[PDB]
Amino acid sequence: SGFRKMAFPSGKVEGCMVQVTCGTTTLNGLWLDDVVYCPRHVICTSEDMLNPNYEDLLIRKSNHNFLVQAGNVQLRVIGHSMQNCVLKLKVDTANPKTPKYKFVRIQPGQTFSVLACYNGSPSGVYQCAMRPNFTIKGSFLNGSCGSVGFNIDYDCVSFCYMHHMELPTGVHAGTDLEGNFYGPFVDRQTAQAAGTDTTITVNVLAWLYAAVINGDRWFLNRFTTTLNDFNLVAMKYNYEPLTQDHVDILGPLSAQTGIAVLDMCASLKELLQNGMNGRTILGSALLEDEFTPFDVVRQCSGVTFQ
Amino acid sequence: SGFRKMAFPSGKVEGCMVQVTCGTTTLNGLWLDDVVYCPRHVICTSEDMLNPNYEDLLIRKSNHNFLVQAGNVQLRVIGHSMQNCVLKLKVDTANPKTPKYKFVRIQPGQTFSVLACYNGSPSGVYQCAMRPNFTIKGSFLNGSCGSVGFNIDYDCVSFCYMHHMELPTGVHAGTDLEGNFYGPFVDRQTAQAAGTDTTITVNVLAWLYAAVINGDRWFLNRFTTTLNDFNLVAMKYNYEPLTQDHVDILGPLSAQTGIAVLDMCASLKELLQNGMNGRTILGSALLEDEFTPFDVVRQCSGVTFQ
Ligand SMILES: *[C@H](O)[C@H](C[C@@H]1CCNC1=O)NC(=O)[C@H](CC1CCCCC1)NC(=O)[C@@H](NC(=O)OCc1ccccc1)C(C)C
Ligand SMILES: *[C@H](O)[C@H](C[C@@H]1CCNC1=O)NC(=O)[C@H](CC1CCCCC1)NC(=O)[C@@H](NC(=O)OCc1ccccc1)C(C)C
Incomplete structure (x- = not known):
């Protein structure tokens, strides 16, 4: 017996974590098949973040401006595109560790495990609930963006969350893997209300x-x-x-x-x-x-x- | 920011979990190099457990009585021995997923991650402290014996706990990887006091x-x-x-x-x-x-x- 807050085993997700660098900014990406997914704000400088025009910022970028490391195995970027608030980098190598996977948008009140990552390397794993106000109460420092939330059903990893930002109350906000934020949030460094939980x-x-x-x-x-x-x-x-x-x-x-x-x-x-x-x-x-x-x-x- | 009870990423340990069966009893084992470690009570029947003579019980067993599955990859047992309360099964194949590892005996008050496992398959991961009275407050059901506790230091897994039993208060007891119990406990199904925590x-x-x-x-x-x-x-x-x-x-x-x-x-x-x-x-x-x-x-x- 006994009851503990328990996360899913993280090994299947560990093998998918990469580091994405654009200029001065480094964050985590998720490498599945020949695509790497990461927050689009990887393209922002510290003064873009106050009011970014993501379309204009991305136009300045080419494939060779995105540096992707898997460990120190390193990937050639052959295309890029923006889907909502996620950037999708096509690479020339399919991840040989890609598990069976799905992208899901979870409902408020559901739970998932977070693999907190820095510089493409896993740090720890814990279980979160998506609050009714579409925030999570996580543990995220600078560099953790692009860390993902997931559930496992036997052999299939359902990715449901990618971390983007911290609000003015210590709570956390992010997107599904199609880049749509949970809740009303936008990827801008500006005061944003979560509303009553x-x-x-x-x-x-x-x-x-x-x-x-x-x-x-x-x-x-x-x-x-x-x-x-x-x-x-x-x-x-x-x-x-x-x-x-x-x-x-x-x-x-x-x-x-x-x-x-x-x-x-x-x-x-x-x-x-x-x-x-x-x-x-x-x-x-x-x-x-x-x-x-x-x-x-x-x-x-x-x-x-x- | 934010602060959560966080376990280590479990992938390195997942690749070491196997299933050990002796007669009617199935539990988890830890496969490192060419050795599989598991609780010695795998050799007990339901009436041995009340007062087992482990030496006499093990003498009845030969190598071919220990069935070890890694997934459904399966291992040939070429020797066996008992070290304190752990059984060590020598197998003919070194685990190709063996990480860099150490066996450590942790101190009371230290913490570690538990990978809870059933039938050799990981179920979940959570963080535990070794209490001052040498129990842990875990989440363990029938079949979880042989699940391990560990810490990671960059690339090295320090295994510190293997689960053996549940006490009369819902708290849990087990050994280090040399088979020595933490605390005063013995591997017998009998009333056992943990003492004041x-x-x-x-x-x-x-x-x-x-x-x-x-x-x-x-x-x-x-x-x-x-x-x-x-x-x-x-x-x-x-x-x-x-x-x-x-x-x-x-x-x-x-x-x-x-x-x-x-x-x-x-x-x-x-x-x-x-x-x-x-x-x-x-x-x-x-x-x-x-x-x-x-x-x-x-x-x-x-x-x-x-
Ligand atoms: C990526 O690794 C970090 C992760 C956060 C750092 C500490 N905790 C985190 O979760 N994300 C960021 O640094 C965000 C940068 C993004 C760039 C432009 C798109 C959106 C933000 N920034 C934040 O998370 C900051 N929070 C924030 O912008 O919330 C809005 C706000 C600002 C002022 C007052 C109220 C609300 C964070 C405070 C650094
Ligand atoms: C192996 O998978 C299980 C894991 C426990 C089942 C439920 N929670 C667990 O942690 N271990 C066992 O079933 C133990 C069998 C061992 C066989 C002979 C060597 C030592 C035990 N048994 C137990 O954990 C039982 N607890 C126990 O024996 O504690 C002593 C006791 C008994 C009566 C009154 C006070 C104290 C458990 C209650 C099934």
């Missing part, structure tokens, strides 16, 4: 089920509630409203524990209204919302990949 | 420095303290006593932030005596002790590996 209610409930499965369970109470009654409580505490779709997604955990979803909602409502009274659940003194149901099921069924 | 004070202080570096810093107070005065507080709250060696290890973080170590101890003393009053530090409502100083420095300097 909310707690991912279905994930909190999934984590309460994980706690029961692991014997942590003082919070189970006597009451039940209704989906409309609970949602009145969710509103006051900035929790996402719970829908029947969420109830259905929680079905397997409900069946495993024998605790009806609305009974668990009643326990959650009392935790929200009364706090935890200095106690903990699965080692946390806060209600955790970065585990999806489905993360919970895999962690307590032992799903593997390769 | 304590909080890793130098790690809490390192994490408070990480918080200041990230602008989280309401807890900085007006006071200072002495190492002897602070240790009186540490005693009452089951914190490890702070030594000058710990102060010296905190030197770089002290120099980076301009906060004297004993001033940070005074902030910690007030957090211990008064709690956090419903506030958070780096997203946690508890004092976190599973980051070493040195983890903090790498996370806020961007150290990479490959």
Whole structure:
């Protein structure tokens, strides 16, 4: 038993990380087949970043201005193009380590693993949730741009996030692998509002089920509630409203524990209204919302990949 | 910026994971050069586990009784031996993916990444601390035995932990790669006491420095303290006593932030005596002790590996 925030094994993604340099700027790229993907702001100087005209900036660049290193194995750039906020560099060699892969645009509340990288070299791996306001709470320093987020389904890597910038609150923003930002953000160094974040209610409930499965369970109470009654409580505490779709997604955990979803909602409502009274659940003194149901099921069924 | 509990990239270790089967029991092994390492309890049946005579049980076994699969690539066993609580199977093929590696026995309070594995296939990766009572708080199900803990120093993997069992409190116990348990535990299915755990004070202080570096810093107070005065507080709250060696290890973080170590101890003393009053530090409502100083420095300097 035990429950930990767990990232996917990163080896398949490690073999795809390269370094991209344009002039003074170095960041990470993702090398799949004969294409390298990276943030288009690799082309910006420190004064372009305040209000860049990316079309005009890219026109000044030719293939030979993009330096791509894989380790110290190095790639010849034979074409370049901009797709939304990502630059796509065609290279003359297909990555021999390309895994089976897909590009996916994830939904708010879903989770993924981040392989944080500097100069094309992996530094660490951790699990993130895409917040309801389309930010992530990551760990990113200068040079981490182009680091990617991903999920694995057995042998297939689903890339879902590429890192671009940090907002004025320490939270992080980036794009899918077609270069479309999650949320309202633009790749300009200017003040940008993320807007109110909310707690991912279905994930909190999934984590309460994980706690029961692991014997942590003082919070189970006597009451039940209704989906409309609970949602009145969710509103006051900035929790996402719970829908029947969420109830259905929680079905397997409900069946495993024998605790009806609305009974668990009643326990959650009392935790929200009364706090935890200095106690903990699965080692946390806060209600955790970065585990999806489905993360919970895999962690307590032992799903593997390769 | 931002601070996350981050594991090492796992690819170098993924290429070393194999499946070991003896009779009815399947677990994970570690394949380095021409040797496969796994828990010796792979030889036990469900009624051996209550009081096993490992010498007598192993004598019944020959090389051909140990089935080792690498993926579905499969290895011929040409010798076997028991070293403390690990079994070492000599195979006829050296692992072509063997990284540069060392076996290390870590100290209590140090951290490492765990690659949780089932049937020789990686499932996930997370960071653990070896508690002062020589347990870890992991996430391990049936079949995870033989999963390993490790650190990376650029290109060298230091293996430090192999998982063996779960105690009567949900905490986990295992050995170094020479098969010596951390702590007082034996590989028998019998009630076993871990003894009182304590909080890793130098790690809490390192994490408070990480918080200041990230602008989280309401807890900085007006006071200072002495190492002897602070240790009186540490005693009452089951914190490890702070030594000058710990102060010296905190030197770089002290120099980076301009906060004297004993001033940070005074902030910690007030957090211990008064709690956090419903506030958070780096997203946690508890004092976190599973980051070493040195983890903090790498996370806020961007150290990479490959
Ligand atoms: C690429 O390695 C970095 C990664 C960030 C550095 C520290 N944490 C990070 O996640 N990205 C950048 O340095 C960004 C440069 C890009 C160039 C032009 C296109 C968009 C930005 N810049 C940032 O992340 C900066 N944040 C930012 O621009 O947010 C807008 C803002 C500015 C002022 C006040 C409010 C909001 C970051 C602060 C360095
Ligand atoms: C190998 O895959 C598993 C991993 C554990 C299963 C669930 N969580 C785990 O970490 N290891 C085992 O199943 C252990 C078998 C070994 C065979 C004989 C040598 C030592 C054990 N068994 C356990 O981990 C069990 N725990 C245990 O034996 O602790 C001692 C104990 C027993 C009763 C009351 C107090 C303490 C576990 C409970 C299945």
